[PDB]
Design an enzyme around this catalytic site. Structure first.
Site, PDB file in Angstrom:
ATOM      1  N   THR A  13      -6.693  -0.637   9.812  1.00 18.23           N
ATOM      2  CA  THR A  13      -6.407   0.118  10.528  1.00 18.23           C
ATOM      3  C   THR A  13      -6.235  -0.220  12.226  1.00 18.23           C
ATOM      4  O   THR A  13      -7.143  -0.703  12.630  1.00 18.23           O
ATOM      5  CB  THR A  13      -7.131   1.403  10.526  1.00 18.23           C
ATOM      6  OG1 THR A  13      -7.190   1.937   9.115  1.00 18.23           O
ATOM      7  CG2 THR A  13      -6.740   2.461  11.564  1.00 18.23           C
ATOM      8  N   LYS A  36     -13.105   3.274  -0.246  1.00 19.73           N
ATOM      9  CA  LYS A  36     -12.787   3.413   1.429  1.00 19.73           C
ATOM     10  C   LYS A  36     -14.151   4.091   1.921  1.00 19.73           C
ATOM     11  O   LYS A  36     -14.417   5.217   1.738  1.00 19.73           O
ATOM     12  CB  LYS A  36     -11.647   4.202   1.612  1.00 19.73           C
ATOM     13  CG  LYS A  36     -10.346   3.465   1.264  1.00 19.73           C
ATOM     14  CD  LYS A  36      -9.063   4.666   1.139  1.00 19.73           C
ATOM     15  CE  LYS A  36      -8.694   5.101   2.564  1.00 19.73           C
ATOM     16  NZ  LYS A  36      -7.662   5.978   2.855  1.00 19.73           N
ATOM     17  N   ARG A  94       0.818  -1.175   0.059  1.00 20.84           N
ATOM     18  CA  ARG A  94       0.004  -0.147  -0.031  1.00 20.84           C
ATOM     19  C   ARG A  94       0.757   1.392   0.083  1.00 20.84           C
ATOM     20  O   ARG A  94       1.652   1.396   0.978  1.00 20.84           O
ATOM     21  CB  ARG A  94      -0.999   0.083   1.315  1.00 20.84           C
ATOM     22  CG  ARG A  94      -1.548   1.259   1.447  1.00 20.84           C
ATOM     23  CD  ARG A  94      -2.933   1.311   2.839  1.00 20.84           C
ATOM     24  NE  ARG A  94      -3.464   2.463   3.262  1.00 20.84           N
ATOM     25  CZ  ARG A  94      -3.051   3.292   4.191  1.00 20.84           C
ATOM     26  NH1 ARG A  94      -2.073   2.943   4.581  1.00 20.84           N
ATOM     27  NH2 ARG A  94      -3.665   4.448   4.231  1.00 20.84           N
ATOM     28  N   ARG A 153      -4.031  18.497   7.900  1.00 23.94           N
ATOM     29  CA  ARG A 153      -2.833  18.261   8.619  1.00 23.94           C
ATOM     30  C   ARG A 153      -2.202  19.286   9.284  1.00 23.94           C
ATOM     31  O   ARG A 153      -2.613  20.452   9.174  1.00 23.94           O
ATOM     32  CB  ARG A 153      -1.865  17.567   7.634  1.00 23.94           C
ATOM     33  CG  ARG A 153      -2.129  16.418   6.673  1.00 23.94           C
ATOM     34  CD  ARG A 153      -1.485  14.931   7.342  1.00 23.94           C
ATOM     35  NE  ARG A 153      -2.323  13.783   6.892  1.00 23.94           N
ATOM     36  CZ  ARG A 153      -2.160  12.675   7.470  1.00 23.94           C
ATOM     37  NH1 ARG A 153      -1.420  12.527   8.759  1.00 23.94           N
ATOM     38  NH2 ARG A 153      -2.970  11.775   7.190  1.00 23.94           N
TER      39      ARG A 153
END
Ligand SMILES: O=P(O)(O)OC[C@H]1O[C@](O)(COP(=O)(O)O)[C@@H](O)[C@@H]1O
Ligand SMILES: O=P(O)(O)OC[C@H]1O[C@](O)(COP(=O)(O)O)[C@@H](O)[C@@H]1O
Ligand SMILES: O=P(O)(O)OC[C@H]1O[C@](O)(COP(=O)(O)O)[C@@H](O)[C@@H]1O
Ligand SMILES: O=P(O)(O)OC[C@H]1O[C@](O)(COP(=O)(O)O)[C@@H](O)[C@@H]1O
Lengths: 418, 419, 414, 414
Positions: free
Chosen positions: D212, D154, D62, D103
């Protein structure tokens, strides 16, 4: 409208109870009748001309009752059946010899032994062996058939308490079973016979061996042109219990309405077959069946599962001895099992197995073996089209082997009819 | 474990090995001709009255053999003929306690002017049940309750389904009816004979779901009209009718005109007893559960918990106090193996509950106790005493007792050990 | 109504389809039913911390006798009792023995004597390998400790293999995943967890899932995704109790950890597929001639039929309440008892909500019974279990004294 | 034999009885079937390190485009491809888009996707898919040269969970992206969303990734927590085709050990699958099919179970015939022989598919071409430990070259 017919609303139900509640007298059967009809030959049904009408009405197996009639008499019965069958050369019809039997006696009388020699000498396909109480009685019948009669199927008649109790050992060495309710309901209390019938049919289905329900199924048609409400119920319930074959005795041997009786058994069986709750039945026959490393067994269940998934019109199987066809039939596909064989005897004997439609292939081998396989499959398709089994745009499962000769079925293919 | 409490044969009997099978197919494979049915026969037997079965003497024999409902067929015989049949049934009963219901089966088209007079006659003579001929729709049964009038309000109406329209409109008929007869004689003429088994199984199934009585009728042991033993198809027919889910099975010519009326009754009792033990309750109870709707009716809620309790402990009987029979019907619909012993003060309710499989009515005839709570417990002991004498109960058995809190309020279940 | 507590998924016809119908918008409504065990330690010892934890949902306080002196645990016990008495939620006190670090050490014996003298409710017996390990514990508890529940901790390979003989003589089981994942390969512990919980459910005996369920909350205010998964799946596996160790004994977020276990458990409990689970527990369970067991299943069946809000049961020892809980009703089991110890111990059983009755026996016993049932209803109303018009099942007995439960009644609330 | 791979639990009649029969001494025999996705980062970029990871079981690398320039990721691709070539071990390469991000489909995502086509990535993990048009924006971004790239959507927020069915309709597969999901919806609801989405993907026959924090603590510890191993096992038991590692491989100190730990858990959990229920429930709900490839697959899977087939060998060009086998979750390994290097990498999204790249000029005779691939299948399986002499295998092929899989043969390995 496809989904309105052959009780598919009911077949799709999620419970047995709900499936019962959705049975619909307006839902017409469309599949070919799959439970075979055994008709007993007698003064009402010996003539070539009577036998032709009986063949057209649905008879698949002709029963010779050696409780009565000389060898000469039965020899005439056999020849008349063969002449009626050949007059259509087409329906293979098997010939079954039902032994006189004891009447702790031995498994076989001196009369029985001579009768079984006669049947071997005349190429009978099946023996219904009377008063089987234990596996040694079966072995005795096998030995009396001797070396020329190794391919004759032995169907043990369970007629008394001991036969019922020793059923597992009898079934193990037998090719099949007859619930012989006539004598059974004299030997045990009459109100118990339905338990022995249901038990034995259940166990035969589990084992993948043919089971016959016999005697008084349409009794009143010996004199009346129409049966009672209890008699139609009994036929339909034998089919719902799981019987491969249903039988007529005096109704065809001596009564006034032999042809109407065959026809009545055909009409009921077709309705009852459409009412089978395959969803529950297939799943239980799976779970309760054992693992097998036998490629024919493995291929057969894969093919039946596949047939259910695409509502296949038929499973075409090439078979030499009938076995691959039997192993298909033991999972009770709704799809017709169309057994292409070169063996006239196997074409007759597979009528012991619910839902197997034999096609006798009479063309000379092709040089390239794979070309001979495809020609028999084609033979299978065309015959199915012309007999109503198959339409263009139908899906069929074809079941074949990797090499010539019995024992090597191992290939399953999915094919559209065009 | 339970072997100590109940015996070492107990679990050999009653087809119990087959009952604990994990699949229907394995259940079939475990049915055993040597597993004797211990429980009391639970499917009611309806016997048509006629020349062969009119003697008070004969009727008493028939009651002993297991007749629970006498059918009067108004297709033939004058009012006076049928008044006498009723009279002889009642005298056989009292000249012995086993209630016998009396059902009037209408002539229908052969609601006519004739049927109306017959129904009025039925109310006049206190019949318990009407089998209404050729019900084709819901209004047909309204015509029948109207004919019965105000004095006939408590008469149960069992609609005879006899033709195609009746089958097609079955749901609306069942909604307005107390019950259904699968009338195979005419149905098997009005529709192809080879389809009747489909109509039978569908109707018994939907009645089972709806919790209403269903009767299987006609030609079940026909050959016994002239023969002392039945055919293999006939015994099979009775057995599968009981396995199909029928509350009642019926005899017509076999009792009305044949030479072996008593033997026919006995044969139905013997078959029905065997077949009832062979019922695969594990599947049936579960499917009846999953399909039946949630219910805030306390009597309905108590019954399913009472039946579940009965199965957990191999309860010999469920003793229920009922006034109209309804609390016993709602137990019956879950088809307990345990006998439903219904104690009632209503002689009519006692007769009418014979329509429901597994209900054994007990008429109680004592003036109420000063304290109601004492009146309850007295009826319950009456249930237990009657049950012990009749071979239902032994000391040490377990029973489930179903009563109410106020004097249609059944809503209590108690687990009780027989002293 | 039917767009709450996963009822669409409850109605599904197969397990696959039930899963496909789980709905994050279907809010839970039933009281949380899985009990939360919190280990007491420096982060959780103070009366003031214990009160926040009771409010957050702690049901059982665990004393880890691997550390701390008798004086230290005596202080823990008294602080729990003062926190509890400050309110009302009964809270059980469980003594988790040191063990081999030879069934019972001399230390273990002194610790067990201490717990008896201090009235502890439960013992988590470490390193149980065989039935004789349990018997030893039982003898160490001696005559005055007959009423103390023994929960055997399965922590190694022998214990797993001999699980059936341990379960037979134990009141219950702890899957002690901490030592187990060292004694056997870590990638197998989930198998031993699922097997043991399944077997405890079949036997109707409480099972506890323990250790590292929310581990990262020792330092973090929010758990990881695997940690919430692990809690939810412990509930879906069938655990009666889920446990916190360092998360409450020493971490920085004891109260939030309890709150997180409460929140997950409630969601998971609504996702339980009762249709399959009740049928399978009915089938696998054995015929019984014990009236309490017969009444219990009859009562749970009845509760499912009318979407009953609760099953009010009168119990002296808690047993009748355990026998209801073993069929996993959706209805809350409201256990009315005079016994303060039983009201604490029933927290070992999923879905049992104790009510300590303190009123004086009525002269007419049948009046005493009805007053306790009414007590049950009124409390159920005030606490949120019961609305007017709900339906409840009431489970009582025919005579005074335990062992005689045998009556079930269907009642409407008004 | 029948004591291994949880076979006693497999033949149980009920799920609860199956749980009760799981056995820590029943060793897995079958090859691990759930694919392992490893996120590439500083801990896992070296060619040496990637080789160790491939041996440990990584099947899909990934690339997280939330961090690092195009050049950074070009080098990650470079090193994965070189690790693969320096040994056959097809490793898929997946591009995980930055998406709406904050972020300490955007203009950026489009450049990233076009960069992905330029470098021949096999899979896109499309961040924050909320609706079907979002997936169309991504296949538009990929353009005509990107048409064979699989799009795994996702699900990361409430809207995606609610519109899941329309998302799944148009996607190749799904990632349960629990990181952001567990912040966007309550953390205690994530397991519901996970179980639903895995269930619906299972029903649809499309791959589903669980992602995750599955082994989060292994970023700094050499061994995972008990909740972490639990979470991996339950993701496999829940029906996931793929399990993922993020920080555990990208930045932590034990990347290889994390892969190995997922392989070990996945192997145990796969044996513990209760196929009898699952296969049966997949049957009922799955629709009557007139597609010969689907019909053959279910017949091939049933056959495999009837004989304990070690492998189903399927010839596939796009992967599809193998995916349709894999959706029935055979115990037998699906050995997929293909000439398409990109089909072979992509089929790792599908549980239980073991691709084999076949590299030989076609044979003169097509029938001869088929049996050479089949034999290539058998020889690889023999070498790789899948097949032993005397085993049974099920062989799935077609009648015409080129969506024509329609034959199954039962074959004994010699
Ligand atoms: O049912 P059986 O007797 O085992 O026959 C099946 C056999 O028929 C075949 O399909 C054709 O065999 P032949 O060409 O020799 O008749 C074989 O491949 C297979 O082994
Ligand atoms: O079946 P039904 O007609 O509802 O009878 C139930 C009634 O029988 C009883 O148990 C007794 O009622 P009575 O004593 O008043 O006749 C009531 O509690 C209950 O309401
Ligand atoms: O769960 P346990 O311990 O058996 O208690 C149930 C008992 O509670 C009761 O309902 C009340 O009994 P008490 O009067 O002693 O409180 C009994 O009838 C019953 O036997
Ligand atoms: O799974 P897919 O992509 O539909 O491919 C299956 C195809 O592979 C084959 O088995 C082999 O044929 P090829 O030579 O084209 O590879 C075809 O017969 C079959 O239709």
């Amino acid at each position: 409208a496809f989904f309105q017919q052959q009780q598919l609303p009911a077949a799709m139900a999620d419970t047995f109870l709900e499936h019962l509640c959705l049975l619909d007298i307006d839902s017409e059967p469309v599949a070919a009748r799959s439970t075979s009809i055994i008709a007993t030959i007698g003064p009402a049904s010996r003539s070539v001309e009577r036998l032709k009408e009986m063949i057209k009405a649905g008879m698949n197996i002709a029963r010779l009752n050696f409780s009565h009639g000389s060898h000469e008499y039965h020899a005439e019965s056999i020849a008349n059946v063969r002449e009626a069958v050949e007059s259509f050369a087409y329906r293979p019809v098997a010939i079954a010899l039902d032994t006189k039997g004891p009447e702790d006696l031995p498994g076989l009388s001196e009369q029985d032994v001579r009768d079984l020699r006669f049947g071997v000498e005349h190429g009978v396909d099946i023996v219904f062996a009377s008063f089987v109480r234990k596996a040694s009685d079966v072995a005795a019948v096998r030995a009396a058939l001797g070396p020329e009669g190794h391919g004759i199927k032995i169907i043990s008649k369970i007629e008394n308490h001991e036969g019922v109790k020793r059923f597992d050992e009898i079934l193990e060495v037998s090719d099949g079973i007859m619930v012989a309710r006539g004598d059974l309901g004299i030997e045990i209390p009459a109100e118990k016979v339905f338990l022995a019938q249901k038990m034995m049919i259940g166990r035969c289905n589990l084992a993948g061996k043919p089971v016959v329900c016999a005697t008084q199924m349409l009794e009143s048609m010996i004199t009346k042109p129409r049966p009672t409400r209890a008699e139609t119920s009994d036929v339909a319930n034998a089919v719902l219990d799981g019987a491969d074959c249903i039988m007529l005795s005096g109704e065809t041997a001596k009564g006034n309405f032999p042809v109407e009786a065959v026809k009545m058994q055909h009409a009921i069986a077709r309705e009852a077959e459409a009412a089978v709750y395959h969803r529950q039945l297939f799943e239980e026959l799976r779970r309760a069946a054992p693992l097998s490393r036998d490629p024919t067994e493995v291929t057969a269940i894969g093919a039946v599962e596949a047939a259910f998934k695409c509502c296949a019109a038929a499973i075409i199987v090439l078979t030499t001895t009938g076995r691959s066809a039997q192993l298909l039939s033991r999972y009770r596909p709704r799809a017709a099992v169309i057994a292409v064989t070169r063996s006239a005897q196997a074409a007759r004997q597979v009528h012991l197995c619910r839902g197997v439609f034999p096609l006798l292939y009479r063309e000379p081998p092709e040089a390239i073996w794979a070309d001979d396989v495809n020609r028999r499959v084609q033979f299978g398709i065309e015959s199915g089209k012309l007999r109503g089994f198959l339409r263009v745009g139908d899906l069929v499962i074809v079941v074949t082997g990797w090499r010539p000769g019995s024992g090597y079925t191992n290939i399953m293919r999915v094919l559209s009819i065009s």
